[PDB]
Amino acid sequence: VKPNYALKFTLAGHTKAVSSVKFSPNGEWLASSSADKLIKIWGAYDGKFEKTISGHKLGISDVAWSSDSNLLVSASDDKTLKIWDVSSGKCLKTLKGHSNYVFCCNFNPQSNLIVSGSFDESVRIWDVKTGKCLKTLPAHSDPVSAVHFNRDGSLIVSSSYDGLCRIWDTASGQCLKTLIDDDNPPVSFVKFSPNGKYILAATLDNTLKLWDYSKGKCLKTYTGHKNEKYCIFANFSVTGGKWIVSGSEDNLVYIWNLQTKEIVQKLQGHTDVVISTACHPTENIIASAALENDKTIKLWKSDC
Protein backbone atom coordinates (compact mmCIF):
# COMPACT_ATOMS: atom_id res chain seq x y z
CA VAL A 1 0.00 0.00 0.00
CA LYS A 2 1.18 3.54 -0.79
CA PRO A 3 -0.18 7.04 -0.21
CA ASN A 4 -1.04 9.22 -3.19
CA TYR A 5 -0.20 12.72 -2.01
CA ALA A 6 -0.79 15.31 -4.72
CA LEU A 7 -0.31 19.07 -4.66
CA LYS A 8 -3.54 20.96 -3.96
CA PHE A 9 -2.55 24.47 -2.94
CA THR A 10 0.49 26.71 -2.87
CA LEU A 11 0.53 29.31 -0.14
CA ALA A 12 2.43 32.42 -1.15
CA GLY A 13 2.93 35.52 0.94
CA HIS A 14 6.10 35.25 2.98
CA THR A 15 8.95 37.41 1.68
CA LYS A 16 11.83 35.32 3.05
CA ALA A 17 12.50 31.67 3.94
CA VAL A 18 9.63 29.89 5.66
CA SER A 19 11.11 28.13 8.71
CA SER A 20 8.29 26.00 10.15
CA VAL A 21 4.68 25.01 9.49
CA LYS A 22 2.30 23.44 12.01
CA PHE A 23 -1.37 22.47 11.89
CA SER A 24 -3.63 23.54 14.77
CA PRO A 25 -4.77 20.59 16.91
CA ASN A 26 -8.40 21.36 15.93
CA GLY A 27 -7.45 20.98 12.27
CA GLU A 28 -8.81 24.38 11.25
CA TRP A 29 -5.53 26.24 10.65
CA LEU A 30 -1.94 26.10 9.50
CA ALA A 31 0.55 28.45 11.12
CA SER A 32 3.78 29.31 9.37
CA SER A 33 6.79 31.16 10.71
CA SER A 34 9.35 32.93 8.57
CA ALA A 35 12.69 34.68 8.35
CA ASP A 36 10.58 37.71 7.36
CA LYS A 37 9.75 38.14 11.10
CA LEU A 38 6.10 37.20 10.56
CA ILE A 39 3.73 34.43 11.48
CA LYS A 40 0.97 33.76 8.97
CA ILE A 41 -2.27 31.84 9.50
CA TRP A 42 -3.89 29.96 6.63
CA GLY A 43 -7.02 27.84 6.28
CA ALA A 44 -5.99 24.18 6.54
CA TYR A 45 -8.55 22.98 4.00
CA ASP A 46 -8.63 25.75 1.40
CA GLY A 47 -5.18 27.25 1.85
CA LYS A 48 -6.80 30.65 2.17
CA PHE A 49 -4.74 33.36 3.86
CA GLU A 50 -6.35 34.30 7.16
CA LYS A 51 -4.02 36.76 8.89
CA THR A 52 -0.49 38.02 9.54
CA ILE A 53 0.85 38.09 13.10
CA SER A 54 3.76 40.49 13.66
CA GLY A 55 5.86 41.71 16.57
CA HIS A 56 9.21 39.93 16.54
CA LYS A 57 12.15 42.22 15.76
CA LEU A 58 14.02 39.56 13.80
CA GLY A 59 13.28 36.35 11.89
CA ILE A 60 11.51 33.35 13.41
CA SER A 61 12.78 29.72 13.37
CA ASP A 62 9.80 27.86 14.86
CA VAL A 63 6.13 28.12 15.84
CA ALA A 64 3.90 25.77 17.88
CA TRP A 65 0.23 25.51 18.91
CA SER A 66 -1.44 25.15 22.30
CA SER A 67 -3.65 22.05 22.63
CA ASP A 68 -6.85 24.13 22.42
CA SER A 69 -5.64 25.90 19.25
CA ASN A 70 -6.04 29.33 20.90
CA LEU A 71 -2.36 30.18 21.40
CA LEU A 72 0.83 30.08 19.38
CA VAL A 73 4.37 30.37 20.62
CA SER A 74 7.16 31.45 18.27
CA ALA A 75 10.95 31.24 18.62
CA SER A 76 13.03 34.10 17.17
CA ASP A 77 16.54 35.30 16.39
CA ASP A 78 15.63 38.32 18.57
CA LYS A 79 16.37 36.03 21.56
CA THR A 80 12.72 35.88 22.66
CA LEU A 81 9.73 33.65 22.35
CA LYS A 82 6.31 35.25 22.05
CA ILE A 83 2.97 33.78 23.07
CA TRP A 84 0.21 34.92 20.73
CA ASP A 85 -3.54 34.96 21.00
CA VAL A 86 -4.38 33.63 17.54
CA SER A 87 -7.87 35.12 17.24
CA SER A 88 -6.70 38.67 17.99
CA GLY A 89 -3.17 38.23 16.70
CA LYS A 90 -2.01 39.96 19.88
CA CYS A 91 1.21 39.22 21.74
CA LEU A 92 0.23 38.07 25.22
CA LYS A 93 3.68 37.48 26.63
CA THR A 94 7.25 37.91 25.51
CA LEU A 95 9.39 35.16 27.05
CA LYS A 96 12.80 36.66 27.75
CA GLY A 97 15.90 34.97 29.12
CA HIS A 98 17.73 33.22 26.30
CA SER A 99 21.03 34.87 25.39
CA ASN A 100 21.13 33.82 21.73
CA TYR A 101 18.74 32.82 18.91
CA VAL A 102 15.74 30.79 20.06
CA PHE A 103 15.57 27.85 17.64
CA CYS A 104 12.73 25.52 18.66
CA CYS A 105 9.62 25.50 20.83
CA ASN A 106 6.59 23.45 21.90
CA PHE A 107 3.70 23.47 24.37
CA ASN A 108 3.15 20.47 26.62
CA PRO A 109 -0.16 18.62 26.05
CA GLN A 110 -1.81 20.32 29.03
CA SER A 111 -0.47 23.58 27.53
CA ASN A 112 0.39 25.10 30.90
CA LEU A 113 4.08 24.85 29.90
CA ILE A 114 6.33 25.83 26.99
CA VAL A 115 9.72 24.29 26.27
CA SER A 116 12.34 26.14 24.19
CA GLY A 117 15.80 25.37 22.82
CA SER A 118 18.41 27.94 21.88
CA PHE A 119 21.77 28.69 20.31
CA ASP A 120 22.71 29.49 23.93
CA GLU A 121 22.83 25.68 24.33
CA SER A 122 20.13 25.60 27.01
CA VAL A 123 16.61 24.23 27.17
CA ARG A 124 14.12 26.45 29.07
CA ILE A 125 10.73 25.56 30.53
CA TRP A 126 8.24 28.43 30.79
CA ASP A 127 5.01 28.90 32.72
CA VAL A 128 2.39 29.88 30.12
CA LYS A 129 0.15 31.58 32.69
CA THR A 130 2.79 33.91 34.16
CA GLY A 131 5.43 33.94 31.44
CA LYS A 132 8.07 33.13 34.03
CA CYS A 133 10.93 30.76 33.28
CA LEU A 134 10.62 27.78 35.62
CA LYS A 135 13.80 25.94 34.72
CA THR A 136 16.94 26.57 32.75
CA LEU A 137 18.49 23.23 31.81
CA PRO A 138 22.21 23.12 30.85
CA ALA A 139 21.20 20.61 28.24
CA HIS A 140 23.84 20.60 25.55
CA SER A 141 27.28 21.80 24.41
CA ASP A 142 26.09 23.15 21.04
CA PRO A 143 22.89 24.78 19.77
CA VAL A 144 19.67 22.94 20.63
CA SER A 145 17.92 21.89 17.43
CA ALA A 146 14.59 20.50 18.70
CA VAL A 147 12.52 20.15 21.88
CA HIS A 148 9.35 18.08 22.33
CA PHE A 149 7.12 16.85 25.16
CA ASN A 150 5.83 13.29 25.29
CA ARG A 151 2.18 12.14 25.53
CA ASP A 152 1.55 13.11 29.11
CA GLY A 153 4.04 15.97 29.40
CA SER A 154 6.15 14.08 31.91
CA LEU A 155 9.18 14.02 29.61
CA ILE A 156 11.03 16.39 27.28
CA VAL A 157 13.28 15.17 24.47
CA SER A 158 15.96 17.53 23.17
CA SER A 159 18.54 17.29 20.37
CA SER A 160 21.68 19.25 19.52
CA TYR A 161 24.43 19.64 16.96
CA ASP A 162 26.57 18.19 19.78
CA GLY A 163 25.33 14.79 18.59
CA LEU A 164 23.13 14.00 21.58
CA CYS A 165 19.47 13.31 22.12
CA ARG A 166 18.56 13.84 25.76
CA ILE A 167 15.42 13.07 27.71
CA TRP A 168 14.52 15.26 30.69
CA ASP A 169 12.12 14.84 33.61
CA THR A 170 9.77 17.81 33.22
CA ALA A 171 9.07 18.14 36.93
CA SER A 172 12.57 17.78 38.34
CA GLY A 173 14.71 18.99 35.43
CA GLN A 174 16.84 15.86 35.71
CA CYS A 175 18.54 14.32 32.70
CA LEU A 176 17.05 10.84 32.59
CA LYS A 177 18.62 9.52 29.41
CA THR A 178 21.23 10.34 26.76
CA LEU A 179 20.84 8.57 23.41
CA ILE A 180 23.64 8.17 20.88
CA ASP A 181 24.68 5.51 18.33
CA ASP A 182 28.34 4.53 17.86
CA ASP A 183 29.06 7.95 16.35
CA ASN A 184 28.40 11.65 16.89
CA PRO A 185 26.83 13.26 13.82
CA PRO A 186 24.90 16.45 14.69
CA VAL A 187 21.29 15.67 15.63
CA SER A 188 19.12 18.06 13.66
CA PHE A 189 15.65 17.02 14.82
CA VAL A 190 13.94 14.93 17.44
CA LYS A 191 10.38 14.10 18.53
CA PHE A 192 8.40 11.47 20.42
CA SER A 193 6.10 9.11 18.55
CA PRO A 194 2.38 9.69 19.25
CA ASN A 195 2.30 6.88 21.85
CA GLY A 196 5.43 8.25 23.53
CA LYS A 197 7.23 4.93 23.23
CA TYR A 198 9.63 5.91 20.43
CA ILE A 199 11.77 8.83 19.42
CA LEU A 200 12.33 9.82 15.79
CA ALA A 201 15.70 11.50 15.36
CA ALA A 202 17.27 13.12 12.32
CA THR A 203 21.06 13.39 11.95
CA LEU A 204 23.10 15.38 9.43
CA ASP A 205 24.31 12.26 7.69
CA ASN A 206 21.19 11.84 5.55
CA THR A 207 19.54 9.57 8.07
CA LEU A 208 16.41 9.37 10.21
CA LYS A 209 16.30 6.83 13.05
CA LEU A 210 13.46 5.40 15.12
CA TRP A 211 14.63 4.78 18.70
CA ASP A 212 12.92 2.71 21.36
CA TYR A 213 13.06 5.14 24.30
CA SER A 214 12.73 2.71 27.21
CA LYS A 215 15.23 0.23 25.76
CA GLY A 216 17.49 2.97 24.41
CA LYS A 217 18.18 1.30 21.08
CA CYS A 218 17.80 2.22 17.41
CA LEU A 219 15.10 0.07 15.77
CA LYS A 220 14.61 1.48 12.28
CA THR A 221 16.61 3.61 9.86
CA TYR A 222 15.25 5.71 6.97
CA THR A 223 17.59 6.85 4.20
CA GLY A 224 17.78 7.94 0.56
CA HIS A 225 17.19 11.66 1.04
CA LYS A 226 19.61 14.56 1.45
CA ASN A 227 20.13 16.07 4.87
CA GLU A 228 23.64 17.34 5.58
CA LYS A 229 23.18 20.97 6.59
CA TYR A 230 19.75 22.03 7.88
CA CYS A 231 17.47 21.23 10.80
CA ILE A 232 14.55 19.71 8.93
CA PHE A 233 11.32 18.70 10.68
CA ALA A 234 10.10 15.10 10.40
CA ASN A 235 6.77 13.54 11.28
CA PHE A 236 4.76 10.46 12.12
CA SER A 237 1.81 10.39 9.70
CA VAL A 238 -1.00 8.38 11.27
CA THR A 239 -4.33 9.54 9.78
CA GLY A 240 -4.06 6.96 7.00
CA GLY A 241 -1.21 4.54 6.42
CA LYS A 242 1.67 4.67 8.89
CA TRP A 243 4.39 6.79 7.32
CA ILE A 244 7.47 8.78 8.22
CA VAL A 245 7.47 12.21 6.51
CA SER A 246 10.44 14.56 6.10
CA GLY A 247 11.75 17.44 4.05
CA SER A 248 15.05 17.10 2.17
CA GLU A 249 17.76 19.40 0.85
CA ASP A 250 17.09 18.21 -2.71
CA ASN A 251 13.79 20.17 -2.62
CA LEU A 252 11.57 17.11 -2.19
CA VAL A 253 9.22 15.87 0.52
CA TYR A 254 10.08 12.25 1.27
CA ILE A 255 7.59 9.69 2.58
CA TRP A 256 8.70 6.31 3.96
CA ASN A 257 6.75 3.25 5.06
CA LEU A 258 7.41 3.24 8.82
CA GLN A 259 7.56 -0.53 9.11
CA THR A 260 9.43 -1.49 5.94
CA LYS A 261 11.63 1.64 5.76
CA GLU A 262 11.08 1.88 1.99
CA ILE A 263 10.52 5.24 0.31
CA VAL A 264 6.90 5.27 -0.90
CA GLN A 265 6.59 8.81 -2.27
CA LYS A 266 8.68 11.85 -3.19
CA LEU A 267 6.67 15.02 -3.57
CA GLN A 268 8.05 17.35 -6.23
CA GLY A 269 7.26 21.03 -6.61
CA HIS A 270 9.42 23.10 -4.27
CA THR A 271 12.44 24.96 -5.69
CA ASP A 272 14.58 25.17 -2.53
CA VAL A 273 15.29 23.03 0.55
CA VAL A 274 12.14 21.70 2.23
CA ILE A 275 12.89 22.74 5.80
CA SER A 276 9.56 21.80 7.36
CA THR A 277 6.75 19.31 6.95
CA ALA A 278 3.63 18.89 9.11
CA CYS A 279 0.82 16.34 9.16
CA HIS A 280 -2.86 17.28 9.67
CA PRO A 281 -4.28 15.81 12.89
CA THR A 282 -7.35 14.14 11.34
CA GLU A 283 -7.10 14.31 7.55
CA ASN A 284 -4.42 13.09 5.15
CA ILE A 285 -2.97 16.53 4.49
CA ILE A 286 0.75 17.41 4.51
CA ALA A 287 2.05 20.96 4.67
CA SER A 288 5.60 21.60 3.44
CA ALA A 289 7.66 24.79 3.53
CA ALA A 290 10.83 25.83 1.78
CA LEU A 291 13.82 28.16 2.19
CA GLU A 292 14.63 31.55 0.65
CA ASN A 293 14.83 30.74 -3.07
CA ASP A 294 11.30 29.29 -2.83
CA LYS A 295 9.38 31.09 -0.02
CA THR A 296 6.21 28.99 -0.51
CA ILE A 297 4.16 26.59 1.54
CA LYS A 298 2.46 23.69 -0.19
CA LEU A 299 -0.55 21.68 0.93
CA TRP A 300 -0.63 18.08 -0.39
CA LYS A 301 -3.62 15.77 0.00
CA SER A 302 -4.00 11.97 -0.21
CA ASP A 303 -6.70 9.28 -0.04
CA CYS A 304 -4.63 7.17 2.35
Binding site: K16, S19, S34, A35, G59, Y101, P143, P186, K229
Partner: peptide, 12 residues
Protein backbone atom coordinates in the same frame (compact mmCIF):
# COMPACT_ATOMS: atom_id res chain seq x y z
CA UNK B 1 22.92 38.82 12.35
CA UNK B 2 21.84 35.89 10.17
CA UNK B 3 22.09 36.69 6.41
CA UNK B 4 18.97 34.68 5.58
CA UNK B 5 17.00 36.18 8.45
CA UNK B 6 16.60 33.23 10.83
CA UNK B 7 18.87 30.65 12.43
CA UNK B 8 17.00 27.66 11.00
CA UNK B 9 17.56 29.12 7.50
CA UNK B 10 21.36 28.97 7.90
CA UNK B 11 23.98 26.23 7.88
CA UNK B 12 25.83 25.83 11.21
Amino acid sequence: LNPHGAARAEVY
